[PDB]
Amino acid sequence: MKAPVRVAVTGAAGQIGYSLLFRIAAGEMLGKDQPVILQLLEIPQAMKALEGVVMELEDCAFPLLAGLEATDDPKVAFKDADYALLVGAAPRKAGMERRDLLQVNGKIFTEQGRALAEVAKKDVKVLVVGNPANTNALIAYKNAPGLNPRNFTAMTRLDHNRAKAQLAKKTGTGVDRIRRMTVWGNHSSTMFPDLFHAEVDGRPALELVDMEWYEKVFIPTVAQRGAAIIQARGASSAASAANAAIEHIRDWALGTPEGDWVSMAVPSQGEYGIPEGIVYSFPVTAKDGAYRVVEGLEINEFARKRMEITAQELLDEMEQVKALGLIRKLA
Amino acid sequence: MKAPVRVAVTGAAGQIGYSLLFRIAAGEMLGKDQPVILQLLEIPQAMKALEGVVMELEDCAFPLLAGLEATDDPKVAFKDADYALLVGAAPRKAGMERRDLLQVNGKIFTEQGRALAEVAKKDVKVLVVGNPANTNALIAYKNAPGLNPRNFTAMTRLDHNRAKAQLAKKTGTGVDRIRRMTVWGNHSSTMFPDLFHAEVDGRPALELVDMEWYEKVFIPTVAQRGAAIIQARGASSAASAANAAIEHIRDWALGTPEGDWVSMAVPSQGEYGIPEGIVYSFPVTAKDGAYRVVEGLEINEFARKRMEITAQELLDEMEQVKALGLIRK
């Protein structure tokens, strides 16, 4: 009964894409009743590989895959898009330093932001996965005049899920009984996983674990988890990143469970005193493609200090992209 | 909710495994009401990577993942297993001839068949994915005394799906309207994709495409599709292979759609005159862990010829393993 929606995915031949696209086409992101048209973008040098990924998608005989098109043109990939998952960012290349990376990312997200504003649905839901996600999302929305800034988000859901997994393991409880986890701030080493409002089968997390464990073990382990995957596998955490992306879009589009919330990095409107405009991870609830920051939560000194550190890092990143003229102003 | 089932997967840190485990844990193989305990096997040198895969699975916070354990011991991985997906086979190392590969696979699938027979559930459902799948399944079940040979299968579902995809493309129809595709025989270059019974939106396939296209374009293209993916991506078709494994198990454990059938390589009981014992792909319907070959189908000359060629290849393969004393002569 449902008309197809168009889902654009960039970096489509890369490792995250390879773990992402099949689950999307299977109906895992937007529902088993929702046909999808996949509009896939790569850089020119990866188009040959992308055509291979297209063949594999065909070879799954997915009943919900109502359309499938690969392109190297963002204005084609984003045409009439209902969702856009911006996975492809500047590749790490030998010789490239931070400022070089910033400029390449600046070009990518300026171009993609502009393309989205020109050709996508006005209510396109955008998720930036490619690193540095929060600041790339800022560049994208600032260069998408005519689109609601709050339709641009960045992914902290992988950190959020990692935090839930660590808490479940420590408390010996099923991860499905962990609620109200929050990761605040930047998708970076300064992220703040918040246990002060989290619940384990209805019980406050900090009645089951102590502050020493929280500070000395939990926080660093969540921060280092991406590195841990690389050390073990010799490859980055593509499958769990793809899972997190699916969950981020799914919970935004289909809604968060009653009594629970999720983490999403979204343009700040001053909630919790976070500077307006920076893309900052907040606890949020969602219903029908719209989300709201969960306000009213008590913030103690431990939390405030960490929320402020990560806010400042985001402000520093913003100043650097402002200095490169990638955005005019934060406000 | 259903009581949890134990799903064993070998080669669990490899490419097919990486595309397979997350969708199993998400409930895509056995249903959204079916919790799964994943019991993962790797060779010792891959255990470090497998622990990394374990961490990634944890980091997905899957509500249905009721247990998760990694091991290098088949008797641990297969313990109380309800399903066993045998993905890891002999790796292609420089300097190894076919005979060397056969010896290594013989060891692997003898050991795993014996382990399954010793420690898995008596009704464990087994799917061999690792190449050469049909013959590896033969070695496995022949060395699995006390287990129903009919519970040992090999995967031709990827060829099946590729065939449906090609027919949908050619006819300009949705792949969801392709029914009754069959791939017969070996998962090899001699496999036979059968359009004589296939239907496109209820219409016989061969009323929409002609025999010239079938023989000259369709068959070679399905046969070469794995090579096509490698040439394009620089890597094998891991994600679509994983998808095919999931569907093979899903349609077997749950059931095939009314009026439709799927392809599964199963130990032959002489259906269609196919020699007995060899693991051969047939059209089958299934439900609740049991399949039945669709019998009574009209087999014309074009089909018969190709069905016999691939049967003979499997017989030759069987004679190879018997001569190495891998199964009883």
Numbering used by the authors:
A (entry chain A): 1 to 331
B (entry chain B): 1 to 329
Give excerpts from the publication.
Malate dehydrogenase (MDH, EC 1.1.1.37) catalyzes a dehydrogenation reaction from malic acid to generate oxaloacetic acid, which is accompanied by reduced NAD generating NADH. MDH from T. thermophilus (TtMDH) is more similar in amino acid sequence to NADP-dependent chloroplastic MDH than NAD-dependent bacterial and mitochondrial MDHs. Similar to other MDHs, a protomer of TtMDH has the N-terminal NAD binding domain and C-terminal catalytic domain and consists of 12 helices and 11 β-strands.
The crystallographic asymmetric unit contains two subunits, which forms a homodimer arranged through a noncrystallographic two-fold axis and is consistent with the observation of analytical gel filtration chromatography. The two subunits are virtually superimposable, with a root mean square deviation (RMSD) of 0.124 Å between the corresponding Cα atoms of the two subunits. The dimeric interface is about 1619 Å2 and involves 18 hydrogen bonds and extensive hydrophobic interaction, as analyzed by PDBsum. Conversely, the loop region between β4 and α4 reveals higher B-factor values, considered to be involved in conformational changes with NAD binding. However, electron densities in the apo-form crystals were of high quality and generally continuous, so the residues of the entire sequence could be modeled into the structure. Even the electron densities of the loop regions for NAD binding are clearly shown. Crystal structures of apo and NAD-bound forms of TtMDH revealed slight movement of the binding loop and a few structural elements around the binding packet in the presence of NAD.
